[PDB]
Structures are given as structure tokens and as C-alpha cells.
């Protein structure tokens, strides 16, 4: 679709068989989701943002559907203020900025 | 133009008679720029993201030229790790997400 930016660009995602709401975030290199029970192996990792660094669980090769578009890649789980879809997955669904 | 997301969506902006580089960031509600000395009255504000909050100065009705496209709105200035153009100005230049 074409998504304007008057409101937050929130979309429904499906991950680990569960539906969630997430923000399409072109300023995020990586995808970060709030604490959740996700199937798969994981490794501790640190990710930094505007306020500093947080500890996350790094899951690799996770299936995630973003408004019906399938992606398979890295998902970080940790104390983010909001679920954010970063460029690592936005590229997989063919997302571009246009103006 | 059309901006793919393989790389950081960095562009040149002009603000207060200065050229700077900034990220087109659909995840930022408001535009936040590195410490800069801007004429005018301002309001203190706190903005939060991954890792917590930072303190910024809120300037209203600031003009910014983004790849030749003019926008006028709120600009937050403070010790941000990154310059971001947020939705408050991205809407003004007609920016959409497309996939
Ligand atoms: C020099 C580098 O230092 P740094 O690595 C951190 O640098 C950064 C810091 C922030 C960004 C931009 C933010 N992306 C982000 O958090 O992405 C994470 C995950 O993917 C990684 O890629 C980059 C960082 C990692 C996001 O787009 C926008 N944000 C809100 C989101 C979270 C939704 C609420 S907001 O910034 O909080 C923000 C809040 C209110 C307003 N009005 C304006 C902005 C990009 C690089 O060190 C740590 C001190």
C-alpha cells in the first residue's frame, strides 16, 4: 500500500503465531519488539537508541508477516517503548520512501 | 524521489542558514536535531525512545528545506545521537511509505 504519515504508521504483524501492532520505523536499523514468548534459540545482545542501550534477546531467521507480507530475519526482544519494524525487515517487504 | 532502505535514509537539510545531514525517520513523531544555536523563544521538553529520555529545546515554526522541499514546523534541539526528520515535517513534503 501507500501509507501517509499524519498518524503513526502502525500495522498488524504476525509473529510466533500471535498478532501484534508495530511501527514502521525507517530510522531503525533493526527490528525491536516488546517482551514476548517467542519460539526459537536466542543470544543476549545490546542495542542502543536515543536514550542509551538496552539488553535484548536476539532471535535469528524468525518468520514475521507484516500486513500480509512475509519476512524472515533477525528480531530483537526487549524493553522497547513500542514494537518497531526496522530496515532489516522493511527491505524484505520492498518498502521505500517516496516524496 | 524514491529512497530505498538498504542504507540509512540520509539527506541534506537546510535550517537556520546551515546545511546538515538528517535521517528521514517515520518512527519519529517530531524532528530532532543535534545541538544548535537557534534564535527565538523555546520550551523545554523530554522525548523518549529505546534506552530512556533526553532533554531537548522545543522551537516552533522553524523552516527546513529538505531536498528542495520546504517545511515549517516544530524542531527539537538537544544532545541527540542522531539528526532525524520526523513525521511533523515529513507530512509537509508529501512523504509516504510504499510497499
Ligand atoms: C550515533 C548512534 O548512537 P546509538 O547507536 C543510537 O543512535 C540512534 C538513536 C535513535 C534513532 C531513531 C530511532 N531508531 C532506533 O531507536 O533504532 C534502534 C533499533 O535499530 C537501531 O538502529 C538505530 C538505533 C537502533 C527511531 O527511528 C525514532 N525513535 C522513536 C522510536 C523508538 C519509536 C518510539 S527516537 O529516536 O527515540 C525519537 C523519539 C521522539 C522524537 N520526537 C524523535 C525521535 C536512530 C539511531 O547509541 C545509543 C546511545
A63 has a chain B CB within 8 A of its CB: no
> In terms of DSSP bridges, do strands B10-15 and B18-24 run parallel, antiparallel, or are they unpaired?
antiparallel
Would you say B5 and A96 are in contact if contact means Cβ atoms under 8 Å apart?
yes
In this complex, the residue of B9, B25, B50 whose CB is nearest that of residue A32 is B50
HEC profile for chain B?
A: CEECCCCCCEEEEEECCEEEEEEECCCCCCEEECCCCCCCCCEEEEEEECCEEEEEEEEEEEEEEECCEEEEEEEEECCCCCCEECHHHHCCCCCEEEC
Sheet bearing A96-98, strands edge to edge: A2-3, B96-98, A96-98, B2-3
Is residue A83 exposed (0-12), middle (13-18) or buried (19+ Cβ within 10 Å)? buried
Experimental method: X-ray
Burial state string for B56-81 with b = 16 or more CB within 10 A and e = fewer than 16: bbbbeebebebeebebebbbbbbebe
Resolution number, Å: 1.7
User: Is B60 assigned a catalytic role?
Assistant: no
Residue from A21, A23, A27 to probe ligand 1 pocket by mutation (most atoms less than 8 Å from CB): A27
Amino acid at each position: 500500500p501507500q501509507i501517509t504519515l499524519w498518524k503513526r504508521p502502525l500495522v498488524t504483524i504476525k509473529i510466533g503465531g500471535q498478532l501484534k501492532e508495530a511501527l514502521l520505523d525507517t530510522g531503525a536499523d533493526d527490528t525491536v519488539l516488546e517482551e514476548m514468548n517467542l519460539p526459537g534459540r536466542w543470544k543476549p545482545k545490546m542495542i542502543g537508541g536515543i536514550g542509551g542501550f538496552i539488553k535484548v534477546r536476539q532471535y535469528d531467521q524468525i518468520l514475521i508477516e507484516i500486513c500480509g507480507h512475509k519476512a524472515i530475519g533477525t528480531v530483537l526482544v526487549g524493553p522497547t517503548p513500542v514494537n518497531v519494524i526496522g530496515r532489516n525487515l522493511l527491505t524484505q517487504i520492498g518498502c521505500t520512501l517516496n516524496f
